[model samples]
Target chain A: IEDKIEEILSKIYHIENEIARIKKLIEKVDQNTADITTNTNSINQNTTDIATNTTNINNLSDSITTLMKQIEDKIEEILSKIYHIENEIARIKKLIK
Target chain B: IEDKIEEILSKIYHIENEIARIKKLIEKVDQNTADITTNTNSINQNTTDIATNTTNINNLSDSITTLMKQIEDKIEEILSKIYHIENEIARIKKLIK
Candidate 1:
């Protein structure tokens, strides 16, 4: 009867030991859950930033196009001035002739 | 003696049930751990994309500056042509006089 009691005590000890290990696993799960929440929030913020950056890049492209058009207009203006100068020089040479 | 055996069996049943609950908690922890791994990977990729976008935006800004400089050079060229045209016209008028 004493041996039977000792066997029950040993079994209880083993069960308690297993329960302690399970508790450790539960703590790890809690930590992982917290990390998941933090990481998900970070991902969301990054997504927002990505969208903002895309819009900025597109706006910059449009500004470049407008600036290029300004340059084109300047080119046309320069050509008109050159044409007038050529005509004036021709007339002056005619007067000399 | 039969009562003692029944008591032991009841305790064993309770312990087994508790262990089963613990196993469920372990499964939950495993799922959260997997989610953390996946989320961390996504965060890292977004960081990479964010860096790349920054460089791209900087490069675009540099290109815009270069284009603006080109426009500035064109303006100077136009002014020079206008100055020469004014001189030629002045010379032609003096010849006519």
Candidate 2:
């Protein structure tokens, strides 16, 4: 009977120790899960930032293209006017000669 | 003796059940940790992608600024030449009159 009592006490002791260990493991898991949640939030924010950047890049590209076209048109018009002036100057020179 | 034996057996049975439950909890923790690892990897990759996008945006901004300056300089030069031509034409008109 005494031997059986000792065995029971040892088993209970073992269980207490196991429970303590498991509790610590659970706490670590909880901490890790919290970290994961924090990382997820950062990831989500980064996703938003990336999307905004992409939109800005696209808009800038479109603006650059429009500006280029406008400059081209303006330069072409100026060139045409210069050509007309050149013809006028040549005619005046011929008249003077 | 029989009563004590039954008591010991009952306690042992309880311990076995508790161990089984603990094992399942451990397995869940392992699975959760694995998922956390996967999420971390994804977050890291996204960080790299964000950095790359930021660099690209800066480069595009620089290019746009440089192009704008070039266009401004070219237009100014052309306008100066046009004024010179106008002055020359006015002087010729005066001489003819």
Q: What is residue A27's positional error in candidate 1, in angstroms? A: 3.2
DockQ of 1: 0.51
Candidate 2 lDDT over residue span B1-87, tens digit each: 677668777877877776776776677677778878888787788888778878878888898799889878878888887888888
Q: Give the C-alpha lDDT of model 1.
A: 0.80
TM per candidate: 0.75, 0.76
Q: By summed lDDT, which 10 consecutive residues of candidate 1 chain A come out lowest?
A: A20-29
Number of the top candidate by DockQ? 1
lDDT of 1 by residue, B1-97 (tens): 5676687788788888878878788677678878878887887888888887888889888987897798788778777877887787788778777
Q: List, residue by residue over A1-97, the lDDT tens digit for candidate 1.
A: 8689669868876887877777777777777788788879878988898989878887888887888888788688768868877887987778776
Q: What lDDT does each candidate get?
A: 0.80, 0.80
> Which interface RMSD does candidate 2 score?
2.4
Error of 1 at B46 (Å): 2.3
